[PDB]
């Protein structure tokens, strides 16, 4: 109903761009074209807690929430998938043209033409999900994002997710606050699977990240408490008429 | 992005409808009201291929296309599931009226409420997913689903779910012809997972069925080498000029 048609989707959509611009051009775009990355790590790892706000198309007022993103978040997510969330390569570039925030580009990027076609885009970091990547194909798509000047946030799910992730040198974690068991998004699932990361994680430039579930004071709290260092924001921040001011007091409710 | 918004809208969905049928309410409906159930389970383990159609509002013609599957499949799934399909009670009602098949509710059913409004709005059977129920609570509604005289639908999705699944009794058995490792939708998944059904799965009534990836005659081939006795068809019958020569040819290439 739901899995297999995003799935479908997707590997329509890559044949699609693949026919448009071939995979040896978009490698050697990505290779010869010049851009420097303005660094994700070095926004999400500032002291205090780090805001990233996503741009959705679905699922000009732009050009204003851009403005006010630019002044309030610490980064920016663009999704470019298609089918489900009516992204595209011209929405993270419009939204590249306006911002001096570094951008992580979001989609099921399972191929690397999709990690050269963010360089290319104006990426400063891709999206990687654990879940549907083997440990070949991850340390593959990974090395190539780094080698390429992009950090990459990877997405957890579960304590072994987790674990095979710490175990293929990741630094950027991104927890999603649901348990599926429970059919509940909570803070609950970050808590328990922040208790297994080693005390040197944050040492070692570790960073976590978390998504879902926090919405009062008391959430936000429970966030410091756990090590988090940045959340990612989504209706919460589109639906503010004063997102730096949500941010502003979220950051002071973290810091005390 | 995806998962976190299904379960909160989900939760959200829950509340408007217990506000308006409390569930004290909706439980006296079930046991009061009578309807005689039409088996699910006798339409899926007759000889042959089963077909069963999926209802979709979303992602008058209708009532023709309820037709035409009344003439051509042995079962049809309703998705009341109401914002990511734009499913809802009323089209569980109007599909109800139109067709004298076995109707399996397709919902996120996490919630005993849900299995007597399920009873209530005429469905035969109910899909639950090994994946959002732990032991206690899919042992709890699926109990409750045969108490009531309706069927259950298990989707499973990997090996231990099967597992699970086998171990908690289940008879009617979905598997989803997805790899998330490969990000494919490919009958290897049925293949590799039926495998491990014991020998007197089909003898005890077990009912294995898939859904996805099918789509050549071929495929279908290579359903019946694995034991499959019903296929879940989606968009493949709904763009079908003439769906009941689709679903004969289909049985004819199972049975050769």
Redesign the interface.
């Known amino acids: 109903?739901?899995?297999?048609?995003?799935?479908?989707d997707?590997?329509k959509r890559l044949e699609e761009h693949k026919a448009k611009i071939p995979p040896e051009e978009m490698k050697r775009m990505a290779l010869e074209c010049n851009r420097k990355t303005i660094s994700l790590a070095k926004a999400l790892s500032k002291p205090g807690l780090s805001i990233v706000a996503?741009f959705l198309k679905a699922?000009v007022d732009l050009e204003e929430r851009i403005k006010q993103y630019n002044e309030a978040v610490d980064a920016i997510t663009v999704?470019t998938e298609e089918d489900?969330?009516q992204g595209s390569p011209e929405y993270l570039k419009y939204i590249r043209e306006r911002t001096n925030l570094p951008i992580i580009r979001?989609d099921?990027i399972?191929d690397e033409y999709q990690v050269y076609e963010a360089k290319v885009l104006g990426a400063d970091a891709i999206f990687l999900i654990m879940?549907?990547?083997?440990d070949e194909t991850f340390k593959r798509l990974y090395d190539l994002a780094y080698s390429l000047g992009l950090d990459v946030v990877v997405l957890v799910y579960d304590e072994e997710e987790l674990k095979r992730a710490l175990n293929l040198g990741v630094k950027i974690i991104e927890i999603?606050?649901?348990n599926?068991?429970?059919?509940?998004?909570s803070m609950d699932t970050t808590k328990r699977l922040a208790s297994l990361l080693p005390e040197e994680f944050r040492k070692k430039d570790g960073i976590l990240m978390t998504?879902?579930?926090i919405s009062t004071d008391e959430d936000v709290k429970r966030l410091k408490k756990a090590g988090v260092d940045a959340f990612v924001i989504?209706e919460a921040l589109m639906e503010a008429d004063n997102p730096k001011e949500l941010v502003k007091h979220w950051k002071e409710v973290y810091n005390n």
Chains 1, 2 share one sequence.
């Open positions: 109903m739901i899995l297999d048609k995003i799935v479908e997707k590997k996503v699922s999704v489900h969330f979001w099921f399972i879940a549907i990547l083997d999603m606050n649901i599926l068991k429970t059919f509940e998004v998504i879902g579930g989504t």
